[PDB]
Amino acid sequence: SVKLAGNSSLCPVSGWAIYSKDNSVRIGSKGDVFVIREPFISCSPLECRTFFLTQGALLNDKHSNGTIKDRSPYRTLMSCPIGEVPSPYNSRFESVAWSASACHDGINWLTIGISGPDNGAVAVLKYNGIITDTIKSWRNNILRTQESECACVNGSCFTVMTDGPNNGQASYKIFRIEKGKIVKSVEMNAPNYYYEECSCYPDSSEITCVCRDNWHGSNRPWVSFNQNLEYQIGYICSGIFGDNPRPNDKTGSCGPVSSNGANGVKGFSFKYGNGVWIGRTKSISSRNGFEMIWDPNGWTGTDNNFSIKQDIVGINEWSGYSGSFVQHPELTGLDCIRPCFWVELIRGRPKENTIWTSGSSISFCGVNSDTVGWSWPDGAELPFTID
Amino acid sequence: SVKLAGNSSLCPVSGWAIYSKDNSVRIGSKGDVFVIREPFISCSPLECRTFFLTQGALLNDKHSNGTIKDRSPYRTLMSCPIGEVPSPYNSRFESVAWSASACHDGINWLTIGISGPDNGAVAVLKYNGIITDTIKSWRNNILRTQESECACVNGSCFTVMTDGPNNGQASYKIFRIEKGKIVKSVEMNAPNYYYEECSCYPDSSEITCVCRDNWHGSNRPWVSFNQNLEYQIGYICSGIFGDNPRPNDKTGSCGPVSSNGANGVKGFSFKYGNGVWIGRTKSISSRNGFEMIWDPNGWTGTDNNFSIKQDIVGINEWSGYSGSFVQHPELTGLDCIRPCFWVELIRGRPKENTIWTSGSSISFCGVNSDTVGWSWPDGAELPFTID
Amino acid sequence: SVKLAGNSSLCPVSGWAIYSKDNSVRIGSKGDVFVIREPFISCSPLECRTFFLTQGALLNDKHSNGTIKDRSPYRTLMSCPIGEVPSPYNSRFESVAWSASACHDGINWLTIGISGPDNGAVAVLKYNGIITDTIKSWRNNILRTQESECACVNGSCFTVMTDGPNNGQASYKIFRIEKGKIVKSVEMNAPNYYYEECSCYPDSSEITCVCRDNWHGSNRPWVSFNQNLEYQIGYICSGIFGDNPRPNDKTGSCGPVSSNGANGVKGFSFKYGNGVWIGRTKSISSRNGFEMIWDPNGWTGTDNNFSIKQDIVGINEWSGYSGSFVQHPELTGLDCIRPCFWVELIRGRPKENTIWTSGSSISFCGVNSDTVGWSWPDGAELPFTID
């Protein structure tokens, strides 16, 4: 057992190969599958796992009612092997949680589970399933974290948490965690910026996060930092806007794009010098479709020109949250950190006539060999028996 | 593989961080979940498991009828990983049992399962799943034990069993067990005391148990002993009465408090010199709510003053049994024995209009970092389809 | 990994401690549990397992219809951990089989599964799941074997199979198997005797089997042999008759007792010099009740006097097959081979108004510490939804 190094670069990729699809909603029409949202994938040096927030209820049972609601004492962070449906019979218990993160440092799993009331929530940190630290809300307004993997470099793992308003300026903290103990945190000086639900990855010993501006930005904010939590900030400049909702593509900005800026969706992007791989919905107004776009000057340039598009989910199909995950050299035998991504395919409320809301998932890994666009959608036929 | 030392002291703690929640009754509305009661948690040097007594039946199935009944030949002691629902598809069989204890000595699991008739019950002891001893009823009146983990120090494990009436003086025995063999037993000289369902923990090579007085005490009796089973006895002095039912808080006693003293509920407390952490129900009269209370002179002092109260379950929510469990240094890497506790959230009879009685659970570990009070209730909507 | 020695004596025992109960039928009212019959228990140097013949169907589903039928192409030998319900989600596949045996030599599992037509069935032998030998019917009349564990001594495993009429003289062969290969077999000279469904155990390097005389004996036949398959034969002499059906207890015989001799039930007994532990039904005419009797001169003496009786299942409750299993010193750390037993608790046809027949199980291990008689019955309320 050895710490992941996290010191190689991101592998450059030409397209995305499908890695997993779980068909959870399809299978939960009959089988015992958790009602879930906020899924994400994270890997150890030996296997990849799907992490997700349960509702403490199964699909197609009465306790699925009301599950549009984000935060309750019943929600738990749990994990199963990638591509398997999340069921009480295959799922490992991680933490009591209505907001979460997790990541493996090479030696053990770190899990971060936020529960408690909206005015003073507490994140419980676990290393190898043992409680190792806690951190309490510091603005008393829904302490919340990534809903995707935290990032590890040389035995330290890093995450971002936000506390405060979700329709205005909030507070954003970056954390360095070692064996599940917070060893350093910094509060970001970021006036007129808004960060939430960061998708963070390691690249050459430093962390880059792409996040959700729920306040006033239809492009995505980014923060990058070193092991000492010295950070830089910015927004993705590309006029290929990454949030949902958003405007039609036009000239972008290196600040927040106010047009259609309020509200948002968790997502991700990968930086490659001045270029960017952008994952986004296909709809500008709802969580429908998904596509990957390579924009070779999109990190720093404001034009709406891009070089490559790869379809993932079709425009008339439900999508949802998306996030980054990596596969480190210790897992693959490669010489670079491999970028991958997952998409949550949300079914039910508020868009469909059900009592419940739940998602399934798809994921892909970046390759340089041949790939193809298609649509891999959820596939479930709603409503269900219980509706 | 090495014996747990058990020679460090209990970690002083300032608050309780939430560790697990299984949502078993919400899930068993559709999934295949055992009807259970009397769960408890116990840990090895590698993992924590939930142990429970099934009723040989699944929730929402006709065999769950009459599960108010305590003792039958169908009841079995099983276990699963902490925070998962108890299902036949994830559950390890331990013993045939309608009363039980279990604990791991660092090398293997000890399990204690009592079955057979009320007038001649037999505890079957197993080590690593092999039967290694038996002990038979010596008062022919419901031989019964902790319904929580036994306690181990340096290769020896310890438990308490009771035999006799449950509305008067009974007989209380203390056992030393090594590799599943009873190596010593003593009968307590405790006239006017009553002890059952003891919650016992190791602390500086010695055992402390905090039990239930079902005869005439609304404070909790305690017994502590060394490896030779030389023991001392008393009741918790605090005016913050620990049993349910009980009177409102007032001046306490260092012997049994007869007011509201008949009947009771399994519980626990942790001793820290002259102070005490008390877990108890929030209602004085029924199994509702739960809270933890730090009384810095409550072990030996009789006033009803205390310094910390942390909410766990809201007063209008169903409560039940509670018990201690520890995490040893061999598991955590800490220099002290970490105290944790679980709470059984009972649903169904006699308080609700169902044909069945079954419980879910929640657990908490002691920490010194920030924590928050809240309510983490069972969450199921009764009645169920079978009712 | 080392061969079981099989050279110590059977442990002398004063009574029987309950080891397992699975509540299969109760649990299969809702959950996914196999329809099964002919269960049995067998242990490796590390765990004990329940082996059973499925009907290729689950309880409370329509394909359970007609499962009174013994032999079909759908029946499979499968195994799960002891005390767990046999479910498609916890059961390991062993062999296609409508008659079976299994046993662990200390290194790997041997399994023996008979399938094919009644006029030319074939036993498929597997060692660690790999086909290692076959043997075909030699009388073309339902080749059949123990329906309980084979017995191992110093790397060789032994079993008995029968072929021919079930209401008359048939043929009986004994086999020595090494790494799943038959290395020697002999056909017994046993005129006027009948052997099937043998319960065989090792004791001081030799094998003793107690079997079912379906032709004309209400006491049990026995055959014992050394590693060379040199054998001795006889019937249990005790007037405490062991089969079902049988007469009421009277003077026994060392030959087959013809009174109520026809038909039978698989059973077991353990020899201790001139004495015998007899397991049997409590009813003389149907498979109801179960009891363990120590008769100190019952192996060779014909009187109906015994010294000890221990109730297991009460007279008005369904029972069924029973068999021996052992726990070798390599598993327990004892200096003797420990005797144990299981009882199948048959539910459904032909005695009850259902479409199906299935069993659950209980088992016990022999001890010298205190024990108690009771009744641990199946517990299921028939008929079921499907009926």
Place this chain on the structure above:
Amino acid sequence: SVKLAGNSSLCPVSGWAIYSKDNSVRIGSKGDVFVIREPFISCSPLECRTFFLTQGALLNDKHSNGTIKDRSPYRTLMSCPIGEVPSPYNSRFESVAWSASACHDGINWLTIGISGPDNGAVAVLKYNGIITDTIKSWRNNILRTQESECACVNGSCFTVMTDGPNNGQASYKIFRIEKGKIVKSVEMNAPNYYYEECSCYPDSSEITCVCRDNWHGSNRPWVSFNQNLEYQIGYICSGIFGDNPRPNDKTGSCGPVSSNGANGVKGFSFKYGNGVWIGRTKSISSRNGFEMIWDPNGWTGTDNNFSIKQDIVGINEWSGYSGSFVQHPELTGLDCIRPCFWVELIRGRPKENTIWTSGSSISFCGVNSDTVGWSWPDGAELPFTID
């Protein structure tokens, strides 16, 4: 952990002993069993697994509707232990796929999953569950592969893929794969031949495949090749025609037999010098029955004389696909590669009046000990509740 040598010859065999049967459709009537088709078996040096293509849906649930359809975005390659039903609670996820292959090289599993559109499908190759390559459609017309195990020799694994029309000349490529990376590929010069759904096995360091001619052959084509992918081609000469449909047996041909030659079924055969073991349907016109036939000159001779026939599934029972699988010496301890085979038992559309199509399986291993013919059919009673 060591690479499978693959340098020994195939074990000559005299008959087929039954190895597994899952009863999946019978079990799926109540249990949580995937709708599947195109199952196959493949073994490592430690265990044998069944691989299968799910339809992303369970039996007896509405999502099973329309599962006659071959290719969708929901279909996934998963695996479970041989003889267990494929359930989401015992199934390992492998790949997103509507056509697949898998094999173990002695160190890790290679999996090949083709998904995406008919005009541009991509095979995703994984080694130990990590994506290691991709190959994309080169004729834009349903890239498709074996639906059975690939074959490995000394650390290289080999498969066959087809792209083009399924009613005319297509293009056929052979691949060498090492640690999941394509290291060589060749396109076959095979005018007037057609190959798909190849059953390929190793034998004396070389690969033999027997395939399906869907264009104009009612005998089966074959291709054999060495590690450098230098190949030879031919059709099986026997007048015992192996495809389905086919004409009645008569004088065969060493090229494609046009009579009844369009259409087909996946199958297999084993070469032993100039002789062949042929598995085929018993019906000449639909997928009914199964039998094995040893024709000692059938590889190269055109007569319809043969010497052994062993019944496997009766002529009035549904059969389907069949394929080879091997057990290497590293798994068995033998001095030769053991031949085995599986048969897919298809139920539902198009032959039965259901909304769904799904398969169970049986499997057999070659032996030289005694064996028997019989029928081991699927056994389910259609229609189901969902129909």
